[PDB]
Design an enzyme around this catalytic site. Structure first.
Site, PDB file in Angstrom:
ATOM      1  N   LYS A 142      -0.275 -21.469   2.559  1.00 57.16           N
ATOM      2  CA  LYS A 142      -0.922 -20.181   2.354  1.00 57.16           C
ATOM      3  C   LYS A 142      -1.100 -19.342   3.614  1.00 57.16           C
ATOM      4  CE  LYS A 142      -0.734 -20.453  -0.970  1.00 57.16           C
ATOM      5  NZ  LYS A 142       0.482 -20.610  -1.832  1.00 57.16           N
TER       6      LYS A 142
ATOM      7  N   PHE B 107       5.898  -6.761   1.891  1.00 54.96           N
ATOM      8  CA  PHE B 107       5.308  -7.369   0.708  1.00 54.96           C
ATOM      9  C   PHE B 107       5.972  -6.890  -0.566  1.00 54.96           C
ATOM     10  CE2 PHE B 107       1.876  -7.734  -2.585  1.00 54.96           C
ATOM     11  CZ  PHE B 107       2.032  -9.107  -2.738  1.00 54.96           C
TER      12      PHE B 107
ATOM     13  N   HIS C 252       5.148 -28.154   6.341  1.00 51.94           N
ATOM     14  CA  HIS C 252       3.692 -27.990   6.352  1.00 51.94           C
ATOM     15  C   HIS C 252       3.042 -29.220   6.962  1.00 51.94           C
ATOM     16  CE1 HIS C 252       3.760 -24.306   4.228  1.00 51.94           C
ATOM     17  NE2 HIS C 252       4.022 -24.800   3.030  1.00 51.94           N
TER      18      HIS C 252
ATOM     19  N   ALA D 147       8.647  -5.199  -1.288  1.00 55.04           N
ATOM     20  CA  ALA D 147      10.057  -5.553  -1.365  1.00 55.04           C
ATOM     21  C   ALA D 147      10.222  -6.971  -1.904  1.00 55.04           C
ATOM     22  CB  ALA D 147      10.708  -5.427   0.018  1.00 55.04           C
TER      23      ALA D 147
ATOM     24  N   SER E 140      -6.548 -17.551  -0.526  1.00 60.08           N
ATOM     25  CA  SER E 140      -5.172 -17.617  -0.984  1.00 60.08           C
ATOM     26  C   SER E 140      -4.830 -18.907  -1.701  1.00 60.08           C
ATOM     27  CB  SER E 140      -4.210 -17.432   0.179  1.00 60.08           C
ATOM     28  OG  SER E 140      -2.893 -17.319  -0.321  1.00 60.08           O
TER      29      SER E 140
ATOM     30  N   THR F 241       6.354 -18.188   3.383  1.00 56.28           N
ATOM     31  CA  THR F 241       7.293 -17.391   2.617  1.00 56.28           C
ATOM     32  C   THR F 241       7.676 -16.143   3.408  1.00 56.28           C
ATOM     33  OG1 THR F 241       6.284 -18.188   0.544  1.00 56.28           O
ATOM     34  CG2 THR F 241       7.668 -16.237   0.408  1.00 56.28           C
TER      35      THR F 241
ATOM     36  N   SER G 194      11.602  -7.302   4.287  1.00 54.26           N
ATOM     37  CA  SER G 194      10.562  -8.331   4.455  1.00 54.26           C
ATOM     38  C   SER G 194       9.175  -7.921   3.991  1.00 54.26           C
ATOM     39  CB  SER G 194      10.475  -8.769   5.919  1.00 54.26           C
ATOM     40  OG  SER G 194      11.624  -9.520   6.284  1.00 54.26           O
TER      41      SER G 194
END
Ligand SMILES: Nc1ncnc2c1ncn2[C@@H]1O[C@H](COP(=O)(O)O)[C@@H](OP(=O)(O)O)[C@H]1O
Ligand code: NA
Length: 278
Positions: A44, A213, A92, A215, A122, A48, A211
């Protein structure tokens, strides 16, 4: 898919996407290459976001790749049951479980860090639509486990502290969500410089635009909508929630916000001032 945790060398992992087998392989593998690229973050934190930024950098801005292939195939997680040239991988894992063979190699690593608070908000929402994760349960309780490191991957505090031990190294770039949020294009150049991969107005500008958000939330391959409901519940919510800085202020009650500062202070003892530290 149960939605329970199991432990590896003391760390909590979700049943299903992970297994003793996978994590180990990642920790003890030997396949690490000079030109490999690793994205490392605590869930979070905006993995991404970065996973995309880099994919664009690689193809100098040709959206072709990020449009055609999903995201968990462009920068595959090491620890996952289905672990991964130029290879772009993500992880992670806390510095003590990560792929050891790394430390002696010239491979590259970009640690992205997010305001611990937002990371919780998040994770809170996500958990509700995540098949591998048990449902939040009461707010306070959820917040108590987070601070206590009683969640998937353990303490956010430990994670960022441990990894930061690589600061100073040249095959290691540390950057925060907030920064990309502040000046995305700037960050893009930086993360470019770091990877020895420059771009011209055209290319850079493309990566920037693609890149953003909106989009990304618009690109099926990147918005996780292609995952099996037995891992994400599309009918309910979305993986790309709001995509903003400081949504924590709309969730934490002052009480919680104070207790947090407390725990946070007694954990980030003498750490350098982070972007988000106000
Ligand atoms: N391009 C982008 N810009 C801003 N936030 C982004 C982003 N891509 C992903 N995010 C946010 O990063 C978080 C998930 O990151 P991760 O991949 O590590 O799980 C989510 O936060 P929110 O829940 O606040 O929306 C998600 O919306
Ligand atoms: Na759930």
């Amino acid at each position: 898919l149960p939605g329970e945790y199991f432990r590896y060398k003391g760390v909590p992992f979700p049943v299903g996407l992970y297994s003793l087998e996978s994590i180990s392989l990642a920790e003890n593998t030997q396949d690490v290459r000079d030109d490999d690229i690793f994205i490392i973050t605590y869930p979070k934190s905006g993995t991404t976001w970065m996973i995309e930024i880099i994919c664009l950098i690689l193809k100098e801005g040709d959206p072709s790749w990020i449009r055609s292939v999903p995201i968990w195939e462009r920068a595959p997680w090491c620890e996952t049951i289905v672990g991964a040239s130029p290879r772009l991988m993500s992880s992670h894992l806390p510095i003590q479980i990560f792929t050891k063979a790394f430390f002696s190699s010239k491979a590259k690593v970009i640690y992205m860090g997010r305001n611990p608070r937002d990371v919780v908000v998040s994770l809170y929402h996500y958990s509700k639509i995540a098949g591998q994760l048990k449902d939040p349960g009461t707010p306070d309780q959820f917040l108590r486990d987070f601070l206590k490191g009683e969640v998937q991957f353990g303490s956010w505090f430990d994670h960022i502290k441990g990894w930061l031990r690589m600061k100073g190294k040249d095959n290691f770039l540390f950057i925060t969500y907030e920064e990309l949020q502040q000046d995305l294009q700037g960050s893009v150049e930086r993360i470019c410089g770091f990877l020895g991969r420059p771009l011209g107005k055209e290319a850079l500008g493309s990566v920037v635009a693609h890149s953003t958000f909106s989009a990304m939330k618009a690109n099926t391959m990147s918005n996780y909508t292609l995952l099996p409901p037995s891992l994400l519940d599309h009918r309910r919510g979305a993986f790309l929630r709001k995509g903003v800085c400081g949504d924590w202020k709309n969730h934490f009650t002052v009480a919680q916000s104070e207790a947090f500062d407390r725990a946070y202070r007694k954990q980030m003892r003498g750490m350098p001032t982070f972007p988000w530290d106000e």
